[PDB]
Structure formats: structure tokens, C-alpha cells
Design a protein around this ligand. Sequence first.
Ligand code: OLC
Ligand code: OLC
Ligand code: OLC
Ligand code: OLC
Ligand code: RET
Length: 231
Amino acid sequence: ATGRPEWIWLALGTALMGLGTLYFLVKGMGVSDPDAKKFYAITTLVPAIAFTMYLSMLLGYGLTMVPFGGEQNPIYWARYADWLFTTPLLLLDLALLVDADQGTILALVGADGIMIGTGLVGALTKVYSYRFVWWAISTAAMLYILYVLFFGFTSKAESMRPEVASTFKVLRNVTVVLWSAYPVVWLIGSEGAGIVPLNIETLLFMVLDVSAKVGFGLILLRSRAIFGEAE
Ligand SMILES: CCCCCCCC/C=C/CCCCCCCC(=O)OC[C@H](O)CO
Ligand SMILES: CCCCCCCC/C=C\CCCCCCCC(=O)OC[C@H](O)CO
Ligand SMILES: CCCCCCCC/C=C\CCCCCCCC(=O)OC[C@H](O)CO
Ligand SMILES: CCCCCCCC/C=C\CCCCCCCC(=O)OC[C@H](O)CO
Ligand SMILES: *C\C=C(C)/C=C/C=C(C)/C=C/C1=C(C)CCCC1(C)C
């Protein structure tokens, strides 16, 4: 409904995830290389899931009211349903690019699950001061992920094919900068201190989400690093 001022950004987000899904879908037709097919499958699913959850927030299904600080506070819980399934897939794109081992993949996906899950608990907590305890644990799990992407993945990438290493380093830098903004927006927005209003908070997440999913995919899927070395 248009009674919520943030609706314009939810509608724009819905449209851009939908167009991004359609573009990757058609671009992925004809790809027969089995390696490339993995990356197209992982990367096309990411905006498709986000499309459905931006639509649920636009129509009002993905919104709940949570009492804290005396007031009833609108909390879009569908963001966490979105991020639970899309953030592991983005990490898989990076780990498959560098041929990460299985133990490291499991550690990354597990820390990511702890990240989003404790962020969800913090979003729905009724005692104000406890919301920030959960924010801190979630941020600690994120810092572990960022550490592994630098001091574990970067070291191996330098020992692989040059195009793999070069594409990895670009996507790593994009991920580190964009993921690090998310905890800041939560802390000063309606889920945390309440300094920035919800309509502006929704704009900022919309720009971060499209850049981290559609922009990330455009860089990856235009690279030759996703094809096997063939003659
Ligand atoms: C790829 C090309 C596209 C480039 C696009 C990049 C733009 C990102 C914008 C961000 C935040 C905008 C923040 C706007 C803040 C307005 C809030 C305000 O000023 O409200 C006044 C208030 O009533 C009294 O303080
Ligand atoms: C206006 C359009 C709105 C947005 C569109 C609606 C999205 C939700 C619907 C469908 C899922 C469609 C398929 C998603 C799975 C794609 C996976 C893929 O492309 O895999 C390629 C691989 O190479 C194969 O082996
Ligand atoms: C490789 C793995 C691929 C993973 C593919 C999975 C994508 C699932 C997508 C979307 C719908 C999300 C639906 C979430 C359901 C929430 C419904 C609910 O619990 O509502 C409670 C209550 O009724 C109201 O507050
Ligand atoms: C690498 C990724 C880093 C992610 C983790 C970085 C955490 C730092 C955040 C916040 C302290 C900001 C102030 C919190 C106190 C809010 C009360 C207040 O002073 O109001 C705000 C003021 O108006 C305007 O700064
Ligand atoms: C879909 C796009 C991406 C990059 C999503 C990123 C989400 C996070 C980095 C979440 C961060 C949080 C932390 C670490 C602190 C509490 C709140 C969050 C769950 C938003």
C-alpha cells in the first residue's frame, strides 16, 4: 500500500531484482560448460529469492510490529528470510571460484547462519538493551567471515589461474565493503538507535541489496574465470 512512505523504494527494489533475474536467466541459456552452469545457477537464484521477498514487503506480508522503547515498531522480518538463503549462496560463489576446501566452506556457511539468525533474534527482541547484545554477537560472526575471505582465500587465489585470481580479488573487495555497511545501517536505523527514519533506512538497504546481488552478479558472469580452461 502507498500509505507507507517507504513503498517507493520497496517497489523499485522489487522491479530491479525482477529484471536482474530475467537478465541472468536469458544470459544463462545455451551455457553447456558444467562449471559455468554452477555459477549461473547459484547467481540467478540470488535475485530470484530476493524478488519474492521484496514483493512480500511491498504487499505488506513481510512486516510485523514489535514493542520496544514504549512504542510499536515496524520491523520488516522478511529481510532476514531473504538474507538467510541468499548470503550463503554469494559465499559459495566466492568459495567455488578459488576451489576452497570443504571444511572452510562449512565454517563460512555456519558462521553466516549464526550471523543472520542472531540478527533476527535481535530484531524481534522486546528488551531494548538486549537488542545490542545480539547485534554484537552477529557482528562478531561477520568479522570471522571477513577474516577468512582475506587470510585464507586470497592466499590460494594467487596460486591459481590469473583470471581466477583477478576476478576473485575484485569480488572480494566488493563484498567486504558492501557487507560491512549492513551492521552500521541497522544500528542507527529503526532496528537500533532510531536516528535515521525508516523510509531513509529502506532506501539505503535497497541500494546495498541491489549492488551486492545484481552488481555482484554482473561482474562475475561477464568474467572468463567461470569457464574451465579448454581449447
Ligand atoms: C549507480 C548510479 C546511482 C547513484 C545513486 C547513489 C545514491 C545513494 C544515496 C543515498 C542516501 C541519500 C540520503 C538522503 C537523506 C535525506 C534525509 C533528509 O535530509 O531529511 C531531512 C530531515 O527532515 C531534517 O533533518
Ligand atoms: C517480472 C519477473 C519477476 C522475476 C522472475 C520471477 C522469479 C520467481 C520465478 C521463478 C524461478 C525461475 C528459475 C530460477 C532458477 C534459475 C537457475 C538457473 O538459471 O540455472 C541455469 C543452469 O545453467 C541450468 O542448469
Ligand atoms: C540452495 C537452497 C535454495 C533455497 C530455496 C528456498 C527459497 C524459499 C523462498 C521464499 C519464501 C520464504 C517464506 C518464509 C515463510 C514464513 C512464513 C511464516 O512463518 O509466517 C509466520 C506467521 O504466520 C506470520 O507472521
Ligand atoms: C568493519 C565493520 C564495522 C561494523 C561495526 C562498527 C560499529 C561502530 C558503530 C557505532 C557507534 C555510533 C554511535 C552509537 C551511539 C548512538 C547514540 C548517539 O550518540 O547518537 C548518534 C549521533 O547522533 C551520531 O553519531
Ligand atoms: C543481500 C546482501 C547482503 C550483502 C547482505 C548482508 C547482510 C549482513 C552483512 C548482515 C549483517 C548484520 C550484522 C552482522 C549485525 C546485526 C544485523 C545484521 C544481520 C544485518
